[PDB]
C-alpha cells in the first residue's frame, strides 16, 4: 500500500492568476497544479486529506508547454496538468 | 493547382512510421543505417 505517499506527491503547487482568483471568490473552487497523470480520483482524495476540506467534483486539463526562443537556441517548456476543484459550502483555503 | 504533397498523419505514420520499418528486414536495415549515421530523428514521429 502506497496510497498515502501517492497522495503526498500528486499535488505540486497552487495556481495564481486572474482566472484563479475570480473562480475562487465566485464558484468557491481552487485551481492547482498536479502531476502529469494525477487521475481525478487521486486529486480528489489528496485534497480531502492534505487540506482537510470537503470537495464536490474535480475537472482537469493538460496545458502544453510553450516554445521559447532563448538566445541563439529554441526550447520548449514541459507540459503540466491543472485541476479545478469545487469545494462544498464549507471552505477553508 | 493541386500539389504532390497532401499531408495526412495517418498515412504518413502507417507508411514511414517506426512500426512500419520494423515489420520488414529492409526497414530494420534502414533504421540500422540511420542509427549508425547518428540521425536525431530515426523516423517520422507523430
Amino acid at each position: 500500500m502506497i496510497r498515502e505517499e501517492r497522495l503526498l506527491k500528486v499535488l505540486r503547487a497552487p495556481h495564481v492568476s486572474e482566472k484563479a482568483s475570480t473562480a475562487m471568490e465566485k464558484s468557491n473552487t481552487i485551481v492547482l497544479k498536479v502531476a502529469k497523470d494525477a487521475t481525478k480520483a487521486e486529486i480528489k482524495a489528496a485534497v480531502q486529506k492534505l487540506f482537510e476540506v470537503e470537495v464536490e467534483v474535480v475537472n482537469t486539463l493538460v496545458v502544453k508547454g510553450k516554445v521559447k526562443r532563448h538566445g541563439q537556441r529554441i526550447g520548449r517548456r514541459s507540459d503540466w496538468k491543472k485541476a479545478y476543484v469545487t469545494l462544498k459550502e464549507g471552505q477553508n483555503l | 493547382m493541386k500539389r504532390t504533397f497532401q499531408p495526412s498523419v495517418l498515412k504518413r505514420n502507417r507508411s514511414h512510421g517506426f512500426r512500419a520499418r520494423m515489420a520488414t528486414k529492409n526497414g530494420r536495415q534502414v533504421l540500422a543505417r540511420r542509427r549508425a549515421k547518428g540521425r536525431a530523428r530515426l523516423t517520422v514521429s507523430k
Partner: peptide, 13 residues
Amino acid sequence: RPVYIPRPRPPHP
C-alpha cells in the same frame, strides 16, 4: 519539441 497528440476535437455542427 515534437508534439505527438493530434487527437480529434469535433464541436457539434
